[PDB]
Amino acid sequence: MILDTDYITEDGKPVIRIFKKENGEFKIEYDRTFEPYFYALLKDDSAIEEVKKITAERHGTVVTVKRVEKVQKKFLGRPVEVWKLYFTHPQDVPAIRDKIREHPAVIDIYEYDIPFAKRYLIDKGLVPMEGDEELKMLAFDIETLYHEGEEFAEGPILMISYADEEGARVITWKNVDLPYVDVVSTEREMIKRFLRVVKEKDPDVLITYNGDNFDFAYLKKRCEKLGINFALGRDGSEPKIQRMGDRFAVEVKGRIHFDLYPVIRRTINLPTYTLEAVYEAVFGQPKEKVYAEEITTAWETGENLERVARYSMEDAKVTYELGKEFLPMEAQLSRLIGQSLWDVSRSSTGNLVEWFLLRKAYERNELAPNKPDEKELARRRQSYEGGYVKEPERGLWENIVYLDFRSLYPSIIITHNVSPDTLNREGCKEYDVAPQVGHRFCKDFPGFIPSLLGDLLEERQKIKKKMKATIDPIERKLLDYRQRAIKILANSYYGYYGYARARWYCKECAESVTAWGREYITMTIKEIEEKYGFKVIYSDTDGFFATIPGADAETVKKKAMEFLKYINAKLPGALELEYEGFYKRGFFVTKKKYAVIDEEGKITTRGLEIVRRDWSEIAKETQARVLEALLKDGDVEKAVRIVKEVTEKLSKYEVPPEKLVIHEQIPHVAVAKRLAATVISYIVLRAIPFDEFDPTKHKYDAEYYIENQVLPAVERILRGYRKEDLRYQ
């Protein structure tokens, strides 16, 4: 199983190393036959002479052109003749390309910006993360001593916690008493044990949360100041800090630094991405947070380091639990894209797709276009973003059904064969024109992207076959993450077409894909109604909620299957409309903002909440009352009446005192001035409601919640009166 690739320079020549883990232990392969290279477009094969004599200087030394050979390729299908220029060292390229482009005899240069190591993989058909071999993993976190102001890494590292499959343990240099805490001597001896532990268990992956930006960089300083070789590397090297975009990424040769942060951020949408947040989000558990200010004072005074260890202990357990839930999916995406997991885990859907095509392009002797130069990159970003969707039919509905298209966009691409290599391709005898936009797409021959998309799905098929043909809980899971990956890559193509940085950029393609989509939605939507007596209530790209005004809950279903079959046979190539589910009721308010109820409770649709990143003010209860009052009970006025009985109750001081406390974490400062000289609850009257300011002996709430906390919450859902229609003085 290949883990990664990279290279060493021996006598000026580049040496590629294939960090792989065969059944058993670590192993490093070496290939010193691979030469760097890139293409050139010439105006005349005569100029090849003046070119091969072009040179640049690197490290005071001269960089010449090694060997050249004219090759046959395809640029977007059309045949093309280019020259392949080989060089001795990889770094030679980034230094000679620009001088070769300047040449007037040279029209252009291609494939000159692909990491030598990355290139090795593609050219040599190798594939990272294959087989069923297991990887040893170990997650770790760092707890330091912060003091605002002082330069970074100023203070020493307090502990080195680490999870691993065996059990989370903590490495502290001061003293604490816990069956899982090992005290040492100084801050130095701590970092030495970790290294000895890491070097001992010798893991394949190292899991960290934001380790690319903090953890590792910290250990760096703390190692120089204390003079200590951080030989974390499998070969004895130190973490190499690569610079990506405007951030950093830490590597550990021979190992796989899996920093979750970039990944978690790309997989979930949350207001804050703290470990505590993420954890609960993914497992539904609490997860407590011990703040820096607390760790310090707790360390200096030595007062209860029991928490700083417990905390760090969890931080590792969390990072590991989390890490094991996300590394699988990742390895498959890595395996599918044919690139390192470390790379993949840090790339965007776009770059995944981008890497995918670079591989199949090679395999297809298809020369690859270049990236946009600043001017162009900067242009494609000025593009206009405008999505269509029919406004949701207000009011409550019964016997609602939802129908989505199976992989709409992808299906479209493959059908019509939308591809930058078939866009306006003259010479074909048959085309397909995208609505409104009209871009013509040749059908005479399968287009690059399409051809590929079809295979991705053609294999998506095989993947599911074995899915049942297998009774091994494991094999099915592996296969599962596989099919999931293929799905992703596929649902990435469309966006990629419009990705500013995309080599195979194609706004025309994008536009067309979206247009067709709309034509198919509107097209199907019209049919379902004027042929089967339905009523599309809420619509959205790729799917819609329909139903039959006053119809039999079961009859609709039986009638919702006839239709499908009908438009399905009336639909083109891969376009296939499916059935999603059945809901008894549900009302809609503005696109994406709705809610419905299946046949067994469940707020199901609840996308419309909108809060204050907490429990608001115990006036959330009212929100649920209303929803169920609407979706479940199916009663209109009952919903408005509740609030009318709520705002007519809180004012007359009939609402409990506890159901009005705003336990929020860091207005709040208006009362955050008394506790003095991150989780304090209060009762707007604006006092501290602990065991004081609330005895019922002589208390008084406030109206800052009736018409400012409950109304703003119900208002939206209530649709269709005014706050005044609910306040009723």
Tab-separated table of C-alpha atoms in Angstrom, residues 402-412 491 516-525 539-544 563-564 567-568 571-572 574-580:
chain	number	residue	atom	x	y	z
A	402	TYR	CA	-40.872	14.900	-3.156
A	403	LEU	CA	-39.209	13.867	-6.427
A	404	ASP	CA	-35.507	14.491	-7.102
A	405	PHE	CA	-33.522	13.689	-10.220
A	406	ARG	CA	-30.883	10.975	-9.884
A	407	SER	CA	-27.592	12.903	-10.279
A	408	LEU	CA	-29.172	15.676	-12.366
A	409	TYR	CA	-26.132	17.716	-13.324
A	410	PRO	CA	-23.810	14.758	-13.927
A	411	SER	CA	-26.541	12.917	-15.811
A	412	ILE	CA	-26.949	15.999	-17.968
A	491	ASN	CA	-20.891	15.800	-8.056
A	516	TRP	CA	-30.714	22.208	-19.179
A	517	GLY	CA	-31.303	21.427	-15.535
A	518	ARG	CA	-33.878	24.208	-15.403
A	519	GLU	CA	-35.408	23.054	-18.683
A	520	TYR	CA	-35.733	19.537	-17.305
A	521	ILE	CA	-37.149	20.732	-14.008
A	522	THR	CA	-39.691	23.086	-15.593
A	523	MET	CA	-40.328	20.461	-18.327
A	524	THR	CA	-41.089	17.648	-15.897
A	525	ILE	CA	-42.925	20.019	-13.503
A	539	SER	CA	-39.336	23.808	-6.136
A	540	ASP	CA	-35.551	23.804	-6.105
A	541	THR	CA	-32.735	22.769	-8.412
A	542	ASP	CA	-32.936	18.997	-8.942
A	543	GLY	CA	-36.130	18.380	-6.978
A	544	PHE	CA	-39.640	19.503	-6.028
A	563	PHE	CA	-45.923	9.459	-13.495
A	564	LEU	CA	-42.321	8.507	-12.717
A	567	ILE	CA	-41.454	10.883	-17.723
A	568	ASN	CA	-38.673	8.366	-17.110
A	571	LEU	CA	-36.558	11.384	-20.547
A	572	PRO	CA	-33.261	11.350	-22.583
A	574	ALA	CA	-29.167	9.118	-18.040
A	575	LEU	CA	-31.847	11.480	-16.727
A	576	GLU	CA	-33.942	9.560	-14.241
A	577	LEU	CA	-36.472	11.002	-11.778
A	578	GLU	CA	-36.901	9.100	-8.536
A	579	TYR	CA	-39.228	9.048	-5.523
A	580	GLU	CA	-37.979	10.463	-2.243
